[PDB]
């Protein structure tokens, strides 16, 4: 069984992602991945409290995290073509909120 706890989930997600995919590009991709991991941990650990939380026991899993990582990667690459530290405002926040 997976160990219960937010910290365990975030550690597992971080170990899942290769460092080459999390460190390349603008240096903000790392913090974007951290936000993705925290959001995944919140929506996957709330799942245990099925009545008070996700009304039905949804199936948010590894594939969803991989798809979200692919989305973040593609949209950050398209928004920031270079490798400079893209400003926070220029981050496609609306795209990530809408797609996810």
């Amino acid at each position: 069984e997976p160990p219960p706890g937010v910290k365990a989930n975030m550690l597992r997600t971080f170990s899942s992602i290769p460092v080459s995919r999390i460190c390349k590009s603008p240096n903000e991709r790392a913090r974007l991945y951290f936000l993705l991991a925290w959001f995944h941990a919140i929506i996957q650990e709330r799942l245990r409290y099925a009545p008070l939380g996700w009304s039905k026991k949804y199936e948010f899993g590894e594939s969803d995290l991989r798809s979200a990582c692919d989305t973040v990667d593609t949209w950050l690459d398209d928004t920031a073509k270079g490798r400079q530290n893209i400003s926070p405002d220029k981050i496609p926040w609306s795209a990530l909120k809408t797609l996810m």
Binding site: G5, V6, K7, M10, L11, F14, V19, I22, C23, N27, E28, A30, R31, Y33, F34, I42, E45, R46, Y49, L52, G53
Partner: peptide, 29 residues
């Protein structure tokens, strides 16, 4: 942070006591 390592060290530094208030749920869930 600007790199994976800082966020990882923050993760391992998380307190043990995960109250339900972490998720936004009331602590009595």
């Amino acid at each position: 942070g600007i790199r994976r390592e800082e966020f990882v060290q923050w993760v391992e530094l998380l307190p043990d006591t995960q109250t339900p208030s972490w998720l936004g749920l009331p602590n009595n869930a």
